[model samples]
Target: RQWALEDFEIGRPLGKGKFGNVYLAREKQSKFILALKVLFKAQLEKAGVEHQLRREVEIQSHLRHPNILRLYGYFHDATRVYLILEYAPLGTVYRELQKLSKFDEQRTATYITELANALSYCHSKRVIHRDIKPENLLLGSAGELKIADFLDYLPPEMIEKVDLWSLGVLCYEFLVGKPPFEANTYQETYKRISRVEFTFPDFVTEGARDLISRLLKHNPSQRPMLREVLEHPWITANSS
Candidate 1:
């Protein structure tokens, strides 16, 4: 039989997610923990992301990797849609980094390796994760990376190059504690990103700086491949 709400006993609410609330729930039979995302049908329609949200369910459900968050399944009632997801107990990587300021080289390299591997897997499946920011990542129970969120704002037949730029920004944030394209206004930041107007701090090592530079290339075709990223000297040496 397909899943039903009665099959789970809802616990505390995890947080107020985008469309609705996410609750911590446990299956009545298996007792396995899950993050249940509830979205009101009307709100989903209002946000104009229901189509994108449906696409996310389709893509994320098919992806299988340790570094990618698992989308278990979904069910809906007349009023709301629900998505069952793997509960990453440790929460978002963005929050962790905020407390620590910035990660050491080893930690940063490790995260980059894991994310690159996950992104490579997505590409092989013909799915491009257009977003690769720290806020979209979570830590699993074993302290492993679990990439999350998949809201698409582009046509289905898009290239994988955009992810490289975001990954570069994320790496810079990991090492420098902020995005390299910081400016006073959103338009200024956009301009900086377009112009590639960022410089490395004195503490950044040559290898790491080079990798970021290659990733943040103005030309997407010139950006290093995910395999190249994994094999980059900085990532290879510092990843553990």
Candidate 2:
């Protein structure tokens, strides 16, 4: 069913972003809860991503995965497009990491495992999440992890190899509490990334070390495919 703005009772704002804002919303009769992302058409035009919405819906609407956020539905008013999405109570995963300072090996492994599954699913759908980072994760009401917040405006680009590298980097950050590279300027950071300049913290376990070694390969071709990664011990070591 197409949802009208009046059909939902808008609650508190969830989070604000570059092109739109998300609100907690409830259906009037069903009492179902959802996140409503309200996007301004003119603003989208100004950003020159008005066409990105169509691509976003096409890719996101049909995807069904335990670790990927669901896009329920969407409707547009004259000046805005409202995206109906699953209600993820917890905000960005990075915010949680910010407080934890770091996660236990098990917790980090669980998150990375879920992410690997999500990545594999996306690739199967022919949609690759190029921007894999903590800030894009949404924690569920029951401590479930799901990938959200697609940066769809840019070129729809992905190489499974790129996803693997980002996954390794994300895993490192979960354990180390910081990205592999740090610099005062964007140019400096780019230089380091281009050179694959990064090192592991001493505390990382052997399982993590081996996985990162294969994932953070300098040459994309040298990296192992995700099917091999799905078979990795760390990713399948436990229920996570």
Candidate 3:
């Protein structure tokens, strides 16, 4: 049975997304605090994202990882659906990192280690997470960062190669204090990516710079495999 909106008391507003705003909510009987993602049916339909949301939600529901958010359950009313989710006490990856402006090498290295392990686990299960950006990452209860959300990469052919490229961007951003390729528009973003054009910005360490170079290689085969990444000196030193 779908729990009506009344059964769960809504708490503070978390953030807004293309679908709807997320809130902290509690189940009346269980009294458990969880994240309530409320999305409007009409909006989802209008955007043609209803089916896509369903697929992603189903995949996320079955995935288990220490660095992954748990989708407890869901309930719906005539107008909206509420997705109950695990509470991220420390908030989002973007939230914390954005405020700090950037992370020190130690913090970035540790976080990447955990994230890499989580992704490796995911791949072993035959899961390919296409969306690995900041907004889709959150902090866990005990302080380890976790992944959230999923989506398809544009155009099927390059999706796999771009997944590795996305990992490269993640590493580059954490160290560079921003995404290596930022632009006022999407077309420009594509251009930067296609050209493999970005600089080290004088702040990235030599080893970090070298790793990113391999990951961002124009030749996809040259990019470091995620499994191979676990063997990097940076990861070996801090992953423990």
* Number of the top TM-score candidate: 1
TM-score of each: 0.94, 0.91, 0.88
**The 10-residue segment with the lowest total lDDT in model 3:** 151-160
Ranking by lDDT: 1, 2, 3
Tell me the tens digit of each residue's lDDT in model 1 across 1-240.
Answer: 497899999999888867788899999989998899888989888868888888889877888999998999898999989888999999988899998999999989999998999989889888877756677799998888999866111111232287787778888889999888787886666667666788898999999889998988877788888999999988999999
Worst 10 residues of 2 by lDDT: 151-160
Best candidate, lDDT = 1
How far residue 72's Cα lies from its native spot in candidate 2, in Å, is 0.6
Q: Which stretches of candidate 3 lie over 4 Å from their true place?
A: 1-6, 151-161, 184-187
**Model 3, residue 32: what's the lDDT?**
89
What is the per-residue lDDT of model 2 for residues 1-101, given as tens digits with 9 covering 90 to 100? 86799999999998797688989999897899988999999999987987887888878989999899999888998999988889888767889999889
User: Could you give the candidate ranking by TM-score, starting with the highest?
Assistant: 1, 2, 3
Each candidate: RMSD to true structure?
3.2, 3.2, 2.9
lDDT of candidates 1 onward, in order: 0.83, 0.79, 0.76
Better of 1 and 3 by lDDT: 1
Question: Which pairs, if any, clash in model 1?
Answer: none
Displacement of the residue 115 alpha carbon in candidate 3, Å:
1.7
